[PDB]
C-alpha cells in the first residue's frame, strides 16, 4: 500500500510483545522416534597402534621451540617479564624461598624439553572418555524451570585465564590450561537475564558412574593432538530428516572422465588429497560470530515468584531410578584392607577416590527440573515471511493460505523471498522512469585484470588462471 506519511516514537515507554502458542513442557515428548542416534556400534575414537608415521619427522616447526613461549632464559630475558612476575619480590631475604627450581636448566628427568613432537598414536587410551558427558537424567514431566532474576553485583578483579588456550579443545579434549573450568564475574558486559534466558536450568547434574578412574587424560598425545586422533566420515545418510530426503546417494561422476576417473589430468601435488570423492577445502560458516547482538534488554528483573526451587528432595520416586546401579562403586571390593598407606606425602584425598553419585543426585528433586534442561524459547521457524512484509496482506492480496498451506503452489515454506513478487502488491505502485534508477555495480567479480588492468599503481599481478578457476 501507499504509506508515504509518517508519525513519531517520542520514547514514552518500551512496547512489550504479546505471548503466542509455546512451551509443551508438561506432556514429555521423548523425541526418540526415527532418531537413529546410536546406530554406529560404539565406534569411539580410533587412537592406538604400534607407531604409525610422524616418528623422527614430527613436523619441525619453530627454531628449536623447546620451552614454548615461557622459555624465560634469565640473562637474555625480555618482554614476557612484564606479563607476569615483573618484580619477582626479593632474591632471598623473605620472598626467595627457592632460587634454582630449574636445576642446571632441566636434568635427565626422562627427556623433558616439552616440544610435543615424538608420536601422536602410540597410547593405551580406550579413547571413549571425551573429557566428560551428562544427560538430563530421565524424561520425567518437564517444565516449571524459569528462575531468572538479574544481578545487583557486577565486575571483579579480571582473571583473563588462557584467553586463547584453556578449556577450548576440538570435539575431544585438546588443551586444559585455565584455573580448572573458567574463572571470573561479568567483568566485560552482560546482555540481560530473561532477555537471553526466560528459563535458565541448573538443577540437572545427572548421576555419573562406571568411572573410579580418570588418570588417563591423554587421549592421543599432547597440545597439537591430545584428543580425537582419527574420526573419518563416509556414510549414505547419517543426517536425519528434512523436507523430503528420498534415500538416494547420487554424485559419482564415473561415466568417462576423458581418459580416467582417478585424477588423470593431474599425477601428484605435494600431498593435498583433493578430488577424493569430496574435499578441496569447502565448508563455509566455520567461526561465524555475529557482532550484532540484536538487543540487551534489562527487564523482567528479580521476580522472586519462583516458589519451588530451594527444596532438596521431598515427594519423589526413589534415588535408584537413573540406571538403578551402574556397577557398584560404593562397595568396589578392590582390596581386603584400606591400602598399605605408609607416607605417600599425604593420604590419597585427591578430591576423588571413586567419584560415587550423591544422594538424589538426579531424580526429580521435587521441582522435577533434575530431569529437564529447558526446551522452548524461540525456534524462529521463519515461514511467517513471504506474506507481504509491508502490509502483512490481511486477506485481499492473499486470503486462502495465511502460510503452511502453500503445497499446490509448491515452494515448501520458502521464507527467503524478499522480491519473488512483493512489488506492486495489488496496489498503486506508480513507478515510472525516475532518477532513483541510477546504479553502477562494483560488487566482487568485475574488479581489476580484465576491467582497466590491475590498478593505477605498480600493484599488479599476473595471477589469472584460464583452464581452471584459480587466483
Amino acid at each position: 500500500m501507499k504509506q508515504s506519511t509518517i508519525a513519531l516514537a517520542l520514547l514514552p515507554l518500551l512496547f512489550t510483545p504479546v505471548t503466542k502458542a509455546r512451551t509443551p513442557e508438561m506432556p514429555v515428548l521423548e523425541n526418540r522416534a526415527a532418531q537413529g542416534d546410536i546406530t554406529a556400534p560404539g565406534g569411539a575414537r580410533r587412537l592406538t597402534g604400534d607407531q604409525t608415521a610422524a616418528l623422527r619427522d614430527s613436523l619441525s616447526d619453530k627454531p628449536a621451540k623447546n620451552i614454548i613461549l615461557l622459555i624465560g632464559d634469565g640473562m637474555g630475558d625480555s618482554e614476557i617479564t612484564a606479563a607476569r612476575n615483573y618484580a619477582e619480590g626479593a632474591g632471598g631475604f623473605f620472598k626467595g624461598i627457592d632460587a634454582l627450581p630449574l636445576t642446571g636448566q632441566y636434568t635427565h628427568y626422562a627427556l623433558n624439553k616439552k616440544t610435543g613432537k615424538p608420536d601422536y598414536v602410540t597410547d593405551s587410551a580406550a579413547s571413549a572418555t571425551a573429557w566428560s558427558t551428562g544427560v538430563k537424567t530421565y524424561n520425567g514431566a518437564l517444565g516449571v524451570d524459569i528462575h531468572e532474576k538479574d544481578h545487583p553485583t557486577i565486575l571483579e578483579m579480571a582473571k583473563a585465564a588462557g584467553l586463547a588456550t584453556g578449556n577450548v579443545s576440538t570435539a575431544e579434549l585438546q588443551d586444559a590450561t585455565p584455573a580448572a573450568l573458567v574463572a571470573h564475574v561479568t567483568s566485560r558486559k552482560c546482555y540481560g537475564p530473561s532477555a537471553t534466558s526466560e528459563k535458565c536450568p541448573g538443577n540437572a547434574l545427572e548421576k555419573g558412574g562406571k568411572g573410579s578412574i580418570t588418570e588417563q587424560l591423554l587421549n592421543a598425545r599432547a597440545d597439537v593432538t591430545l584428543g580425537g586422533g582419527a574420526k573419518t566420515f563416509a556414510e549414505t545418510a547419517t543426517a536425519g530428516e528434512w523436507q523430503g530426503k528420498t534415500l538416494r546417494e547420487q554424485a559419482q561422476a564415473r561415466g568417462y572422465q576423458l581418459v580416467s576417473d582417478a585424477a588423470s589430468l593431474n599425477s601428484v601435488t605435494e600431498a593435498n588429497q583433493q578430488k577424493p570423492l569430496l574435499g578441496l577445502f569447502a565448508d563455509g560458516n566455520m567461526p561465524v560470530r555475529w557482532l550484532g547482538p540484536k538487543a540487551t534488554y534489562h527487564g523482567n528483573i528479580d521476580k522472586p515468584a519462583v516458589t519451588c526451587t530451594p527444596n532438596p528432595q521431598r515427594n519423589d520416586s526413589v534415588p535408584t531410578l537413573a540406571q538403578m546401579t551402574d556397577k557398584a562403586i560404593e562397595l568396589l571390593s578392590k582390596n581386603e584392607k584400606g591400602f598399605f598407606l605408609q607416607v605417600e606425602g599425604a593420604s590419597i584425598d585427591k578430591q576423588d577416590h571413586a567419584a560415587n553419585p550423591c544422594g538424589q543426585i538426579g531424580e526429580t528433586v521435587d521441582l522435577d527440573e533434575a530431569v529437564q534442561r529447558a526446551l522452548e524459547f524461540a525456534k524462529k521457524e521463519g515461514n511467517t515471511l513471504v506474506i507481504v512484509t509491508a502490509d502483512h496482506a490481511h486477506a485481499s492480496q492473499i486470503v486462502a493460505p495465511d502460510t503452511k498451506a502453500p503445497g499446490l503452489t509448491q515452494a515448501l515454506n520458502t521464507k527467503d523471498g524478499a522480491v519473488m513478487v512483493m512489488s506492486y502488491g495489488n496496489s498503486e505502485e506508480d513507478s515510472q522512469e525516475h532518477t532513483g534508477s541510477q546504479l553502477r555495480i562494483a560488487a566482487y567479480g568485475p574488479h581489476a585484470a580484465n576491467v582497466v588492468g590491475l590498478t593505477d599503481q605498480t600493484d599488479l599481478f599476473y595471477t589469472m588462471k584460464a583452464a581452471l578457476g584459480l587466483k
Binding site: 532418531q35 528462575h147 579434549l173 566420515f233 554424485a251 560415587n356
Partner: protein, 280 residues
C-alpha cells in the same frame, strides 16, 4: 570462640578420610536425617551438622581451608560476594563455623540474614566444551567452588547454580552468562541446536552430501533432490545429550556457488541461465 568441631567425626569418617569418602558419609547421614523423609526437627538440626561438615569438606577450596586450619588460625578473608551454602543453613551452624566463615555468613535459611547477592558471572566457553562441561571447579568473586552444570549452552544465555552465589537467604545463586568463542555456530534451545549449513547449489539440486562438523564428530548431511536457501534440517541425535538420546541440530540451508568454475562447469551453468532467460 575456639569450639573447633571435627567435621570428619560429625560425618563419622577418620582424620585421613578422602573428600569423596567424606561425601559418602554425608550421603549416609543425608538419607538418615533427611528433613521431609524423617519428620523430626531433631534430625533436621543433625542434618544441618551433616551439611556443616559437608559445607567445609564438599569442594577443593573449602576442603583445603579446613586442612590448612590449625596451621592458619585466622579465618579466610571475605570473598567479595560471600561464602556459598547451597542448602546448608549457615545461620544455625556452630559459633566455630561463625568464626571461620564469619565475614560472609550468607544466611541461607536464617530467614532474613542477608539479601541473596545474585552473582552473575560471564565465562569464555566452547560448544564442544558445552557438550563436555562436567564436574569442574570455578573461581568467581574471590570464591573457588566446584559444580557439575548440565552439558549444553547458547551464546549470551545463563547457566543456573542454585544457592552457590553471594551472601543471602532469598536465593542469590550463581548465574553463568556464557561468552562463546569465535565458533558460535550451534545456538541451543533445550537439547536442540541451530547452526547454518553451507550447501553448494549443484549438490542441493541432485541431493548429494555436505559435511556439518558436530560436537562429538563430523556428520555427512544427506540433502533432498532440489533444496532452497531458508529450508531447515533437524539432524536426529546431533544435539546435547538426553535420556532417550541427543537433541536435534537445526541447520539453516544456504545455497552457495564456488564462484570460480572449469570450462565444463561454467558452460552448463550458462545453459541453465539461458533456460531461465527463455522464461521471459
Amino acid at each position: 570462640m575456639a569450639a573447633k568441631k571435627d567435621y570428619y567425626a560429625i560425618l563419622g569418617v577418620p582424620r585421613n578420610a578422602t573428600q569423596e569418602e567424606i561425601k559418602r558419609a554425608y550421603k549416609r547421614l543425608a538419607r538418615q536425617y533427611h528433613p521431609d523423609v524423617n519428620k523430626s526437627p531433631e534430625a533436621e538440626e543433625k542434618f544441618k551438622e551433616i551439611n556443616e561438615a559437608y559445607a567445609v569438606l564438599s569442594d577443593p577450596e573449602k576442603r583445603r581451608i579446613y586442612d590448612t586450619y590449625g596451621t592458619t588460625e585466622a579465618p579466610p578473608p571475605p570473598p567479595p560476594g560471600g561464602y556459598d551454602f547451597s542448602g546448608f543453613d549457615v545461620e544455625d551452624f556452630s559459633e566455630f563455623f561463625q568464626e571461620l566463615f564469619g565475614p560472609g555468613l550468607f544466611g541461607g535459611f536464617g530467614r532474613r540474614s542477608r539479601k541473596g547477592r545474585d552473582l552473575r558471572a560471564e565465562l569464555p566457553l566452547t560448544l564442544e566444551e558445552a557438550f563436555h562441561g562436567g564436574e569442574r571447579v570455578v573461581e568467581v568473586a574471590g570464591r573457588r567452588v566446584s559444580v557439575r552444570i548440565p552439558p549444553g549452552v547458547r551464546e549470551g544465555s545463563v547457566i543456573r547454580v542454585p544457592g552457590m552465589g553471594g551472601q543471602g537467604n532469598p536465593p542469590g545463586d550463581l548465574l553463568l552468562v556464557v561468552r562463546l568463542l569465535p565458533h558460535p555456530v550451534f545456538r541451543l534451545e533445550g537439547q536442540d541446536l541451530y547452526a547454518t549449513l553451507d550447501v553448494p547449489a549443484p549438490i542441493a539440486v541432485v541431493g548429494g552430501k555436505v559435511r556439518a562438523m558436530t560436537l562429538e564428530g563430523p556428520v555427512e548431511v544427506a540433502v533432498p533432490p532440489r533444496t532452497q536457501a531458508g529450508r531447515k534440517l533437524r539432524l536426529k541425535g546431533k544435539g546435547f545429550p538426553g535420556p532417550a538420546g541427543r537433541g536435534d541440530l537445526y541447520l539453516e540451508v544456504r545455497i552457495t556457488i564456488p564462484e570460480r568454475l572449469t570450462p565444463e562447469e561454467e558452460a552448463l551453468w550458462k545453459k541453465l541461465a539461458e533456460a531461465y532467460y527463455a522464461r521471459a
